[PDB]
Design an enzyme around this catalytic site. Sequence first.
Site, PDB file in Angstrom:
ATOM      1  N   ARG A 236      26.758  56.241  26.500  1.00 11.55           N
ATOM      2  CA  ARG A 236      27.304  57.742  26.923  1.00 11.55           C
ATOM      3  C   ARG A 236      26.562  58.449  27.991  1.00 11.55           C
ATOM      4  O   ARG A 236      26.795  59.613  28.292  1.00 11.55           O
ATOM      5  CB  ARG A 236      27.175  58.661  25.420  1.00 11.55           C
TER       6      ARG A 236
ATOM      7  N   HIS B  85      20.915  60.298  21.275  1.00 14.04           N
ATOM      8  CA  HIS B  85      21.520  58.909  21.603  1.00 14.04           C
ATOM      9  C   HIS B  85      20.333  57.932  21.455  1.00 14.04           C
ATOM     10  O   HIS B  85      20.702  56.718  21.847  1.00 14.04           O
ATOM     11  CB  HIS B  85      21.853  59.219  23.159  1.00 14.04           C
TER      12      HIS B  85
HETATM   13  C1  HEM Z   1      26.945  67.830  27.146  1.00 16.46           C
HETATM   14  C2  HEM Z   1      26.896  68.195  25.998  1.00 16.46           C
HETATM   15  C3  HEM Z   1      27.464  67.764  24.917  1.00 16.46           C
HETATM   16  C4  HEM Z   1      28.609  66.972  24.683  1.00 16.46           C
HETATM   17  C5  HEM Z   1      29.905  66.856  25.919  1.00 16.46           C
HETATM   18  C6  HEM Z   1      28.676  66.454  23.541  1.00 16.46           C
HETATM   19  C7  HEM Z   1      29.861  65.466  23.227  1.00 16.46           C
HETATM   20  C8  HEM Z   1      29.839  64.939  21.529  1.00 16.46           C
HETATM   21  C9  HEM Z   1      30.921  64.002  21.401  1.00 16.46           C
HETATM   22  C10 HEM Z   1      32.349  64.122  22.346  1.00 16.46           C
HETATM   23  C11 HEM Z   1      30.561  63.688  20.560  1.00 16.46           C
HETATM   24  C12 HEM Z   1      31.499  62.903  19.376  1.00 16.46           C
HETATM   25  C13 HEM Z   1      32.695  63.738  18.888  1.00 16.46           C
HETATM   26  C14 HEM Z   1      33.284  63.327  17.438  1.00 16.46           C
HETATM   27  O1  HEM Z   1      32.954  63.310  16.448  1.00 16.46           O
HETATM   28  O2  HEM Z   1      34.531  63.128  17.603  1.00 16.46           O
HETATM   29  C15 HEM Z   1      29.291  64.092  20.117  1.00 16.46           C
HETATM   30  C16 HEM Z   1      28.580  63.742  18.819  1.00 16.46           C
HETATM   31  C17 HEM Z   1      27.199  64.162  18.654  1.00 16.46           C
HETATM   32  N1  HEM Z   1      26.464  64.969  19.429  1.00 16.46           N
HETATM   33 FE1  HEM Z   1      27.229  65.905  20.968  1.00 16.46          FE
HETATM   34  N2  HEM Z   1      27.473  66.528  22.983  1.00 16.46           N
HETATM   35  C18 HEM Z   1      26.805  67.148  23.608  1.00 16.46           C
HETATM   36  C19 HEM Z   1      25.626  67.866  23.380  1.00 16.46           C
HETATM   37  C20 HEM Z   1      24.978  67.426  22.239  1.00 16.46           C
HETATM   38  C21 HEM Z   1      23.794  68.077  21.868  1.00 16.46           C
HETATM   39  C22 HEM Z   1      22.847  69.128  22.807  1.00 16.46           C
HETATM   40  C23 HEM Z   1      23.392  67.540  20.743  1.00 16.46           C
HETATM   41  C24 HEM Z   1      21.977  67.789  20.391  1.00 16.46           C
HETATM   42  C25 HEM Z   1      21.520  67.378  18.930  1.00 16.46           C
HETATM   43  C26 HEM Z   1      24.114  66.511  20.525  1.00 16.46           C
HETATM   44  C27 HEM Z   1      24.319  65.698  19.176  1.00 16.46           C
HETATM   45  C28 HEM Z   1      25.228  65.051  18.746  1.00 16.46           C
HETATM   46  C29 HEM Z   1      25.235  64.112  17.643  1.00 16.46           C
HETATM   47  C30 HEM Z   1      23.936  63.785  16.790  1.00 16.46           C
HETATM   48  C31 HEM Z   1      26.394  63.549  17.937  1.00 16.46           C
HETATM   49  C32 HEM Z   1      26.884  62.379  16.705  1.00 16.46           C
HETATM   50  C33 HEM Z   1      26.801  61.220  17.339  1.00 16.46           C
HETATM   51  C34 HEM Z   1      27.072  59.970  16.767  1.00 16.46           C
HETATM   52  O3  HEM Z   1      28.099  59.210  17.008  1.00 16.46           O
HETATM   53  O4  HEM Z   1      26.763  59.317  15.820  1.00 16.46           O
HETATM   54  N3  HEM Z   1      25.436  66.681  21.252  1.00 16.46           N
HETATM   55  N4  HEM Z   1      28.765  64.913  20.994  1.00 16.46           N
END
Ligand code: HEM
Lengths: 573, 70
Positions: free
Chosen positions: A234, A96
Amino acid sequence: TCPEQDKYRTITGMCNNRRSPTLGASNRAFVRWLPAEYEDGFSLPYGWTPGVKRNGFPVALARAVSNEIVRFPTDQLTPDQERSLMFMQWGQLLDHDLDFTPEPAAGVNCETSCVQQPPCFPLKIPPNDPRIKNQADCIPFFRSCPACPGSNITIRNQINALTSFVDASMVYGSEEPLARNLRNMSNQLGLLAVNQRFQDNGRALLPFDNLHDDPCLLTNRSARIPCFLAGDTRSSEMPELTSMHTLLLREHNRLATELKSLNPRWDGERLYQEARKIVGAMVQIITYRDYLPLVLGPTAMRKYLPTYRSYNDSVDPRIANVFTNAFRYGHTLIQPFMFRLDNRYQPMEPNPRVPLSRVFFASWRVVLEGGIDPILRGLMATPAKLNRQNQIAVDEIRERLFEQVMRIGLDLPALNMQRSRDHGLPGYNAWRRFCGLPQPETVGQLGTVLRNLKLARKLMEQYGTPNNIDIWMGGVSEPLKRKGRVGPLLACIIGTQFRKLRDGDRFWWENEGVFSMQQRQALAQISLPRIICDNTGITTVSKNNIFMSNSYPRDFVNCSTLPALNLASWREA
Amino acid sequence: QVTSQNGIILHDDSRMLDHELQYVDVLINPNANPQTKERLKAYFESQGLNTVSEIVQKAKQDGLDTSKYD
Ligand code: HEM
Ligand SMILES: [Ca+2]
Ligand SMILES: [Cl-]
């Protein structure tokens, strides 16, 4: 037009690289490390037109891939005995800082309709779905906003709304209006604004945001606690994430307070910028000294992150489109509960294990159920989930994502694959070739790449060929590097992106001119354990490495044994 | 200006924040730190909110509690 003297980063990342001043600035297009692969050659995702194939094979439904390959009995979750849940949480907090891909808000409403019409790209439901019995239903999905909107002349790309630099932009914002909203303008002390209505045992909480259809309210309608406001939008998505943002906000204010005592003449701006600059260096140090080594493991870490030599203004610091999908590897680390522990690291009653499906957007749990200390102690002393080839991701996110705030529960793994197709990301083999690795063409070759013929069969049955495997699904399917938590494909993509973010960052903390020699000696002593000691009521914390330590009392020490950051060398002469 | 993920609106840059409504207490305080009072009037003037009444009206229009400013 850039200045030739400037002490601090811009909020937008503009002017970081002086000959190419938009690189890493916010609200620009992702860079493509490989050319986009769309169904029609420029905009429509694979899977858009019923019956149109990809490289001669049918496009597997993302939800069917999720069902057949990702699903597993929650029973059998395997704790990682060498990783804390804090390892998961730093990963999300870090993501983020690096990328956010805008999409349009709720012609047809993609949230309530199942009609495929732009910007909707809903996930269709396979027969015999374990959860969604009405096969004419769908999981909603909005396509990411195009970078050049309203244009066929050109190939579709997506936007990064964030500064790509590791610069603590999830604390301070990435656009100037929001960055001013986050600051305490009641005075000249250089502080981030704190919540005016609530406190966590007399320690600051994030301010509240103002949303018309606020989702944090739906999670508990009678508690009426709205979502929080941080540098990244977020921050309320889960209370563990909220706790990290809350932690860094306090540390900012703590450092600006010390700095004013040391430099009583300094005005608010100088104090804000100096504190912001330390916080940024701390995110860089924890990330590259403590977090990335445990992601990549040593071999990959030495191959893709060789030792820093200096700033190189020919390196492109932009986030790659593919990275936004590959760095989602950490979804495989998610435990299905939030764990809260009391001041003796024992389950906190009444509810010490809340299912994730009832903490999404539940800001009321921080305000009313005991602040951020129990959440932080759960992160330090609970093990992360281990990724294994038959236990990829848990049903709290595969069946019940955002259940409380939404007409239907989303499938996060299935969204990752639909999102890679939305983004025109090439498939598994193309990224293997970009990484200089063997491209399997047959099931026997694939079984050998994965050291798992059973999983190779599943993948061939869904996709038809390894060329069509979606990057995230193939990346998390690989067996893990030694002392690391991704396989070779993601190790390459992830390591390469973090190398470019370091070497292409004029304000990287080790770059000559950023800090003084004496500052860099002081900053080497920081640690996330210490930062927890300085800004909470927690007196016992994980011992370095915070991301490896996960068991109480074995892995823990008293705060008094950890030196603090010495700010002497910030005293102005 | 409106950012949203997965249908959910996460931020609306055109909606006034609650802790910023409390900066009005400085504008209306006759004995407020004159340097700080001038920075806040510049800040609000920048947003096209040029009078204390324009601030209050926009807060109330955006769902905030603008009692205390009768
Ligand atoms: C609490 C744990 C986590 C979530 C709840 C969560 C949720 C999301 C969601 C809803 C998205 C967008 C989904 C979509 O494409 O429709 C999302 C994107 C990304 N995550 Fe998620 N995430 C949780 C946890 C993590 C962890 C531990 C990550 C570790 C690297 C992580 C990464 C990402 C990334 C890089 C994205 C893409 C972001 C973008 O919009 O460019 N998340 N996550
Ligand atoms: Ca950033
Ligand atoms: Cl790319």
